[model samples]
Target chain A: WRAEGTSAHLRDIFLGRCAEYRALLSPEQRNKDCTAIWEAFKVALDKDPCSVLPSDYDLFITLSRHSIPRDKSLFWENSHLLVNSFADNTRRFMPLSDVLYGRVADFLSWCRQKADSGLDYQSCPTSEDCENNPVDSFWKRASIQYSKDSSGVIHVMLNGSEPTGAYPIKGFFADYEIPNLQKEKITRIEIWVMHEIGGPNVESCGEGSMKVLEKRLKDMGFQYSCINDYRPVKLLQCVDHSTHPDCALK
Target chain B: WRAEGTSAHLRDIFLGRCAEYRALLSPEQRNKDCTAIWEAFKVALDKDPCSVLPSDYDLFITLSRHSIPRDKSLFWENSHLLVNSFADNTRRFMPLSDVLYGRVADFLSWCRQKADSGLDYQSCPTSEDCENNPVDSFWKRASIQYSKDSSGVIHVMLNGSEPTGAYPIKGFFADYEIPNLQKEKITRIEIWVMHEIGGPNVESCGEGSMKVLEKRLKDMGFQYSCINDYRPVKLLQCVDHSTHPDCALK
Candidate 1:
């Protein structure tokens, strides 16, 4: 039922196509109208004859006029598909590292580069770039890859998780408890819930990371100027108290 | 200088290498590999014989994938690029009306599919089909296009203009006005300021419509939401709080 000659065939297809794609990458190396792109497509088709859209050729020719040509390996990558799954008597769950490695990496790659500058690393797609990679996964799995962002003060995104089927309870702070942050107290941690711990709400799937922002004022022994708990973006601006002796950082 | 050549001659070079990009898209059309992707790269190269990189082809692929391709006809019909001119002491700003028109239309198409099926519009290659139209602009300069959101609210996003060169005492809010909307209301308006605004802080050229929003929203009895300020996504929720019972009906 596979077209690109099964997953095994894709390995050969990827190798050949990668070279042809690389040839087209350089501006000077390129000949007009993509002698390279055509060659690349042909090899892929031979490997898995019915893998793409028929007018895809026409589409590419129509594409160049309003754009800057780029590689899809980097420009595009994704996991198969995601569908809702329900087990007869079970719920799903797992660690952050495992889930994204499974169902979510492809979609993330698309989301990140949809409207991005090619220069910034954040703009480029970041895949695990390894074997046993989880691009193809079954529906019963969890999502593993995601990002946690909060950068300023004590921003807390509380992650409530419990794997057991019993009334799941206990709340742990995302990016909390563990060890060295170079900073004494943890501020923000992004947690990826493998399963939908909470449902029916947007913040479901063991869903909703609570953001707890710690307040900082005068006379605090904290070494840093600010303590953030939310993400790469959340910064709890220190409210300067004129009455406090330690108002100014020494 | 433009690469001016007859259609026949162009065709020879254009399809000269169609197989290169076989792997990029159309798993249904043919078995593709790097060759197909590269061929599409070549086709994109042919479309714009002056491309600088292969990944630059990403831009091309984005459009080709669209229902309409950004080409000569579109260039004339749509103009989203804004430019500024000066007269003696006062500077005159011009709207990239045609481009803005198409983009706004595209934005609507994007929103509809997003709310309905949770699907994102493919790409706005400007060369490709403009999202909803997938073929052409549905409305002209005269007829206004309208769409109802899943929220059951009928919202309108139309183009408006005003006299420039006055940083009035009443602030940017004094410049324009929206009709009939209630005052002191939470009518969130997104002022997509054109990047062409002269301030060093300004970024994109076509997003330059913010000043008008400030004036228009205030006059229409609306206030800023404060949360989604200066974002690519700006939304306004309309409710029938109109004291005039008939106002909500119409």
Candidate 2:
């Protein structure tokens, strides 16, 4: 899942994001945040990927704090592409990363350290490779911060076709994001599950892990509602595949 | 190990620190940081204490970010009173919590949520009651952030006479404090072990868990040196005892 020179690419992405977000801050406070962030990111470098834990990114998490716009905070698990596209097509909501990261949203990219204390630009690690690695750690830190800062009505896009379940009790959504959901701050959470346009629905609202997620929220005393093939997200499929037969059915 | 009416005392400490530290910030930013920090603190309320995670205090960590003065970062385990007394007596080094939390440095205090949706101002929880309680989570969050922000030479004070070893690989020091010691930012770590005025030297440098701690630091690629009954911390024993034999030797 990684390619050679990916290390350099990820660094470029990091620097680019720093510059991009740095500009967004006031002139006096600009460089301080980015420099602190760079220093924080550099700590995990030249070390074993597994050795880098969630606490490793504590500083970065502290520095990257930003407000997620109301009704625009979107979270997803196995439905990255469609979810982002739904936000993009309708401009209804913005993916959480889009706001925190601004111009440099590279959630799909990851890297590992080489044997020589340098990064392997050619390879990008996956979730299975190491959850605490720098790439995953950033998202874990960022996602939870986003969840904490978010308020009012928010949306979660899940994959109904996910074989294991749309929201497993692991990974970014279940572990990091859910725990930091800020029950007192948020009013209601609206969950939407989408299957492949013609694929069988493997899981849906009030079923499987979604059901578990609902109960977890209730346990936390949060208000929530679930929808299967939510109209707005379904329309995303229609617009993304305007020429498909399903696009014109309704 | 909880006492009734401890929550109100803790809240007073927080408000006191807010007013104390709030003055140090620019006039415009005063009250805002404290208010936000209080909001962040409340995120862990109204929940089962065991369920509180490290990420629970993300916002407070961000809002409470402050500079740790040069050579002022003091870390301690099982030596809270002696360490703070040393800092107060010399005014040379300040404990990490003293700076991060200002006057409200009550890391030992914990509060529980009521049967209703509010925090019970009557009780303070102990570690035995719940390791992940709200108060512990705050210190965990604050301590790590302090570790990350600290740079240059730093000092760690440990109780050398504990039967369990001067530096156990657990509790706040080993778990929250040590791991977050920003390796790249820090130049060196100075370890000081102190004992009671007339007590037997049960633990010393290179003994018990002190050996394990040194190995752990080296494993993390940190440069560190240890001392048995460091003179400065040892002098505190003299100040308290006034007639101790070792106090005259130094």
Candidate 3:
């Protein structure tokens, strides 16, 4: 590639091309349009909208890079190079919102269906799914329900004062992996504790815990919520699940 | 520098430079105009309108490998290569927003000058600036205020409450190093502690120490408003202050 030669040359090239795009603009407007684009970008570069970390917009394109345009001359030969280049790029990008939310959502529904179909007092931890002392119902408002398993993981259902069959859902996904459409499947996910029930001993947990758990509930994406963080030490409060789906053992 | 290309070579490098810069409506206008932008993005990507990441835009710019103006030859030759070479010229680019509420706010005001001009307390950790407690006040709120002579730990007065005065406004910093913020200047750092008025009783220390300590009056951040993440293993009702802070006897 030839190197750039001059500012005048650059400006001429920039403005000249600016004119070609100007023709694509409405006859009534062109110059006014260019100035606005300049100011908007100046603001965005300075703003850096999402304060959340480890994020980038280049997600779906990561998987899509393996395939090139149908109109390309060097599509096949160069596409592999691009795909190979993506090992570095994957670390630099995250999944698209659909890939993130929808795919995760589908996985959750599948897990729930499995749990609802055969979960019971005897089926857990002992059976394939390890349904420990499964109650017929999980109180959507229980203060803290221990994750029933041979493993000592405790998940307090989160949410304060709400209605839904969705009791504060918590559990590990290594025990529950899910599939995506065309690529590698996702795995080993955890979830946030829910605190839907606001009454009784809830206040004693204090305002800060309530508030933080409240934030976790509202923070879920389109796909699914997280299994509240893992508590290395907690009294596993067994539930009397009279409210859950009635599919347990005889 | 060589001139292998001209203005005609550089393609139009903007996606929605027209809509965003020139056509962007005010917050209200954008709110209204965004409906169409939302529809376009959602339809093309098969995703939600509001969840589009920047990499999924409809228009994008791909600046040519080397194109510059003639008048700015030397500068162009020197720094022109730094330009971003996004592989896909059409993947679309979204500019970030400039400021909060679209208004550019100023940086936080530095108060070092103002804080220094007044009676300097930076070197001294004392209750002097506090309204509830005065410096050297033995019985300010509810605890016995004393200072250790050798260690120079100025203990606070919270005889009844175990976890009193979490106030950073007038408390020592760090867990250990705080024994001396004033070692170089004031000769001693004050350590505050709360001991029961009747003195440390053993039986009560095991059961209601934390509960008893909560009785002492506190304001704002000083209050134990939440069940701290860590469960209470010991009570503060009969806890020791370890040592007290006294004037530099050495």
Top-TM-score structure, candidate number: 2
Query: Model 3, range A214-247, lDDT digits (tens) per residue?
Result: 3543352212234331121111110122122221
Reference-based lDDT, residue A226, model 3: 44
Please name the candidate that would achieve the greatest lDDT relative to the true structure: 2
Query: Which tens-of-lDDT digit does each residue in B1-250 have in candidate 3?
Result: 0111112211122222222322223443332222243243222123322222333332211110111111111100011111111111111111011111110101100111112332212322223332222111211110110011112222222222333322222332222112322232222222123233343432222134334333321221132221221111111110121122210001
TM-score of model 3 relative to the true fold? Answer: 0.17
Higher-lDDT candidate of 2 and 3: 2
Candidate 1: Cα lDDT at B202: 31
DockQ of each: 0.05, 0.01, 0.01
Instruction: Choose 1 or 2, whichever is better by DockQ.
Output: 1
Top-DockQ candidate index: 1
B183 Cα displacement, candidate 1 (Å): 13
Candidate order by decreasing lDDT: 2, 1, 3
Candidates ranked, most accurate by TM-score first: 2, 1, 3
Q: TM-scores for all candidates?
A: 0.23, 0.46, 0.17
Per-residue lDDT of candidate 2, residues B1-250 (tens digit): 3644333334434644554445445555443455557666767654675567768878766777667766778888888756555565224576864664534545335555645565666675666776776666767777778777777888998888888778878778888878787877888888988877789698888888888998999898889899877654554354334444454321
